[PDB]
Structure 1
Amino acid sequence: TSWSDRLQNAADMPANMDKHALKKYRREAYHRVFVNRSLAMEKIKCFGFNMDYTLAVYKSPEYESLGFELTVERLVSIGYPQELLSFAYDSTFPTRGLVFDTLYGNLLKVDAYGNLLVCAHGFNFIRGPETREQYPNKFIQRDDTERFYILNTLFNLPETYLLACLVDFFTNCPRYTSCETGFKDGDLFMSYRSMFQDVRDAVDWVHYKGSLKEKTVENLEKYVVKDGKLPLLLSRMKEVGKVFLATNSDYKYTDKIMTYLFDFPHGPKPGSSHRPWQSYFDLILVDARKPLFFGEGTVLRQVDTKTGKLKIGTYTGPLQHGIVYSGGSSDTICDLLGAKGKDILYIGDHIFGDILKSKKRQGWRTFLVIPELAQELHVWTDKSSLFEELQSLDIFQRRIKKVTHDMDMCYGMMGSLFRSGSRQTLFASQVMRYADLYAASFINLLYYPFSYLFRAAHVLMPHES
């Protein structure tokens, strides 16, 4: 059972819009919206959306496994050894939000202060004192962005595994001599840094010049979660405010995915005329180039939606019906919709590119969709006497390490997305700090009334308490 199974099962359900069933429904952890800072839903005048892994949630492990297969095939085609063809994707290994240390070739799970919670060199877990050799303070300088790469998204799940595999393969293969910063093969030296770049280029290549997109769209039911409730939610939002789409994706791909997500023999509710995905948005924008979008951005262009090509030149007209934009910046959206940032709830999945940057650069209100929260919740309960037990020992050592360990293993080899025992990861700390609201899915907003007040409790400093 994957988080996409959980998500697809709630998606295979019709909306009961009785105000008594609605409130009842949101009592369940799974259908709940979580609050980091208070948010009055009535102040929101614009609901903003991203597509990939937000509106379009790719199925797991199917889509990761596809993306992995093709990156291997791109690496092998450019020269990596044919053994790679025998790797297959393992969804039990990679946790999202890991740092790849391009110097020493380790996958690291770290806290908000660069403290090491987990260290893995290929599939070998470095523990305790072995690690202090490379990390003498058990700590990394997050500022060293040249050395440390953070695998923020569900798109990096396959590359997270592939880096482990690759390090494993060259380590255990007797043609290659392992050194501190890479591998020697005769007179060729492959650093972890160059291997990492090759992988990073290959993923990018599969996404942009390979066949991941063509393959995804030719079996959509296999790769994308479809929900009858998405159109109903959007139509409700359009009643009380403005709705927009801003994706890094191109128009032709967005149109294939969006079309499919709205493909039901009705519109918002059963019995209503179907309408095309584009009637649900007041503003559609593609090739957004987030996070640069939340700064200077790029030049505002206009899509020709017949050819799926950009019209030549910068677009200098107003918002008219049917217009599709490409590029521009977050200020385009505020200007065209006449909104302030605090009037905009922006729903996305990329902690850095979507949520962090819109919050800090523009002060927009944020909603982080976290699809693994479906399965992370299920496990947080059924092992709450493993947690509540670890909790207890802290109050009351070698028994603390042992219990941390098996707590995490339930999540997988790399542990919870959110913590390693009693220690919170960087990812968690960033969700708490930048995501005003968060949930397993944005559809959870359907179970809350029009003018709800999400309440977080006020924070007190230690001397204040």
Structure 2
Amino acid sequence: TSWSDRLQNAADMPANMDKHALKKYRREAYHRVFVNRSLAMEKIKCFGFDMDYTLAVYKSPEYESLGFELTVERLVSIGYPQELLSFAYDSTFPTRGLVFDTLYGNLLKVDAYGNLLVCAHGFNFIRGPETREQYPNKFIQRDDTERFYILNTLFNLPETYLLACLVDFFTNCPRYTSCETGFKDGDLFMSYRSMFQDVRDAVDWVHYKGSLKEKTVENLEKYVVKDGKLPLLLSRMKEVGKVFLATNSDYKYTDKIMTYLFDFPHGPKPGSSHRPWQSYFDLILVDARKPLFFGEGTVLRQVDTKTGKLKIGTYTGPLQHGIVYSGGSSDTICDLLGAKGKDILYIGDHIFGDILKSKKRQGWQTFLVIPELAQELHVWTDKSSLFEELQSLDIFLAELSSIQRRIKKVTHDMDMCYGMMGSLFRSGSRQTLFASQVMRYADLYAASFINLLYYPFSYLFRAAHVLMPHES
């Protein structure tokens, strides 16, 4: 069962909008909204969305596998060896948020302070002592962006696996000699950095120039979660505030995906007339170029929705029913909708890109969609005995070597329940950089924004006040 299997199972359920049913349903961890900072829903005047992996949740592992296959084909087409075509995507390997070390060709899972939690070279998981040879302080400077690339997005999942595949392949292929910073083939030297750049470029190519979009839209049922409750929730949002879309995708793709997401024989509820997807939004903005959008942005343009091309000129007019915008900035939205920062709840999956920047730069309130939570929660609950044992051992050790080896064993067994690279949120008792970012920048979070449907209009989401140690 993948996380998108969980999301689709919940998607197939009709909405029971009886008060007591709703209260009961959001008791279950699976349908809850989780709260890092208190948020009075009654004060939200505008709800904003990203599209990809927010409204349009791509099915796993099918979509990652398609991305993987096309990226591989692109590398082969530009001259990588034919053996790449024997690779096959494996969803059990990658966890999101890993760091690729371009100097030494390792995938690293780190905490918020750059401490190494996991290190793999290809498919070889490197133990603590061996890690010290390349990482003397078991530490990386993560803002050294010339060296380290953080694979934080869901679109980075196939390249996460591909990087490890390529390191493994070149290591084990007798044509190549393994060196500390890459692979030697006579008078040719391929650095891990050059290899990484080729992979990144190929992923980019597949998304922007290749066939990924075309292959997705030709089989939307295979690739995209569809849920009759989406229009219901959006309709309810629109009763109490404004609704906007701000997506980096182009109009033609947006229109295809969104048309599919609303293609039911009814509107918001069963029995109601179907309405076009555009009718759910007070403002539609494509080609957003986030994160630049949250600063200077780009010139505001208007989409000719008949051709899918941009009209000639910067758009200087007012908000008009039926207009579709392109480019602009976050100020466009605030200006056109008459909203100030804290009046906006912005709903997205990009915890760097959108969520962090909207909060830091504009003071927007945030809702982070974490699709993997839909399955990670099932593991967390199923294996809570293991975590409880882990806490207990950390405690017993503190109050003072068999205990340390045991901590390592339990940490490993727990972690392997999630996959080879462990939980998105932790390795054993140590939180990941990703977890830290979610806590710091996501006011609310959940496996799906649809979970908002189960809380009433003016719900007050509550988090405990934080005290300093000297205050506690």
TM category (shorter chain) comes to: over 0.9
Separation in 1, partners of 2:422, 2:113: 18
- Once the two structures are superposed, the pairs formed by residues 42-441 of structure 1 within 5 Å of their partners are 42-396=42-396, 397-441=404-448
Shift of 1:354: 1.2
1:4 is displaced (CA, Å) by 0.5
Measure the CA separation in 2 of the matches of 1:258 and 1:243: 15
Shift of 1:146: 1.2
Q: Distance in 1 between matches of 2:335 and 2:104?
A: 47
- 1:262: how far off? 0.1
- Cα drift, residue 313 of structure 1: 1.8
In structure 1, the residue corresponding to 2:406 is in which secondary structure? helix
- For residues 295 and 127 of structure 1, the distance between their equivalents in structure 2, rounded to whole angstroms, comes to 43
Please list the CA deviations of residues 204-251 of structure 1 after superposition, one character each: whole Å capped at 9, or x if unmatched.
Answer: 100011001000000000000000000000000000000000001000
Deviations 1:303-356 (A, max 9, x none): 111110011221111110111111111000000001001000000000001110
Question: How many angstroms apart in 2 are the aligned matches of 1:101 and 1:58?
Answer: 28
**C-alpha displacement at 1:152, in angstroms?**
0.9
Q: By how many angstroms is 1:142 displaced?
A: 1.4
Task: Quote the Cα distance in structure 1 between the aligned partners of 2:382 and 2:353.
Answer: 33
Shift of 1:203: 0.5
Match of 1:132, SS state, is helix
Q: Distance in 1 between matches of 2:128 and 2:62?
A: 35
Deviation at residue 49 of structure 1 after TM alignment: 0.3
Structure 1, residues 85-128: CA drift from partner, whole Å, max 9, x if none? Answer: 00000000000010111111100000000000000000000111
Paired with 1:251 and 1:201, the residues of 2 have a C-alpha distance of 24
CA deviations on 1:366-413 (whole Å, 9 max, x unpaired) are: 000000101100000111110000110011111111110110000000
Most deviating of 217-226 and 307-316: 307-316
Which residue in 2 is equivalent to 1:455?
Answer: 462
Q: Distance in 2 between matches of 1:264 and 1:334?
A: 32
What whole-Å deviation, never above 9, does each CA across 1:255-293 have from its counterpart, x for those lacking one?
000000000000000011100000000000001011111
Question: 2: distance between equivalents of 1:251 and 1:66?
Answer: 22
Q: Does the residue aligned with 2:170 lie in a helix, a strand or coil?
A: helix
For 2:252 and 2:185, the matched residues in 1 are separated by 44
Q: 1:232 aligns to what SS in structure 2?
A: helix
Gaps of 5+ in 2: 397-403
Inter-partner Cα distance in structure 2 for 1:373 and 1:463: 34
- The Cα shift of 1:143 comes to 1.7
In structure 2, C-alpha distance between the alignment counterparts of 1:117 and 1:61, rounded to whole Å: 25
Shift of 1:177: 0.7
Instruction: Give the Cα separation in 2 of the matches to 1:291 and 1:401.
Output: 40
Q: The residue matched to 1:361 in structure 2 has which SS?
A: helix
Cα distance, 1:153 vs structure 2: 1.1
The CA distance in 2 between the partners of 1:216 and 1:48, in whole Å, is 25
How far apart, in 1, do the equivalents of 2:104 and 2:286 lie?
38
Q: Distance in 1 between matches of 2:418 and 2:385?
A: 15
What is the CA distance between 1:151 and its match in structure 2?
Answer: 0.7
Normalising by structure 2, report the TM-score: 0.98
- Determine whether 1:11 maps to 2:11: yes
The Cα offsets for residues 52-93 of structure 1, whole Å up to 9 and x where unpaired, read as 000000000000000000000000000000000000000000
**Superposed displacement of residue 186, structure 1:** 1.3
What secondary structure is seen at the aligned counterpart in 1 of 2:92? coil
Q: What are the Cα deviations for residues 3-32 of structure 1, in whole angstroms up to 9, with x where unaligned?
A: 000000000110000000000000000000
In the TM superposition, residue 196 of structure 1 has moved relative to its aligned partner by 0.6
Shift of 1:176: 0.6
Q: Matched residue of 1:53: which SS?
A: coil
Per-residue deviation at 1:180? 1.0
Q: Give distance in 1, aligned partners of 2:78 and 2:186.
A: 19
Q: Secondary structure at the match of 2:137?
A: coil
Structure 1: distance between partners of 2:365 and 2:114 = 27
Quote the offset at 1:435 in angstroms.
Answer: 0.0
Aligned pair count reads 465
Which runs of structure 1 show a deviation greater than 3 angstroms over 4 or more consecutive aligned residues?
Answer: none
Identity %: 100
Structure 1 residue 453 displacement after superposition: 0.2
Which range moved further: 238-247 or 140-149?
140-149
SS in 2 for 1:57: coil
In structure 1, C-alpha distance between the alignment counterparts of 2:83 and 2:324, rounded to whole Å: 45
SS where residue 278 of structure 1 aligns? helix
SS of equivalent to 2:325: strand
Rounded Cα–Cα distance in structure 1 between residues aligned with 2:46 and 2:295: 20
Q: What's the secondary structure of 2:145's corresponding residue?
A: coil
d(CA) in 2 for partners of 1:141 and 1:407? Answer: 28
The alignment partner of 1:69 has SS state of helix
Q: Could you report, residue by residue, the CA deviation over 1:405-431 in whole angstroms, capped at 9, with x for unpaired residues? A: 110000000000000000000000000
Give the whole-Å Cα distance in 2 for the aligned partners of 1:343 and 1:146.
Answer: 38
Please report how far the alpha carbon of residue 155 of structure 1 lies from its aligned counterpart in structure 2 after TM superposition.
Answer: 0.6
Structure 1: which 5+ residue stretches go unaligned? none
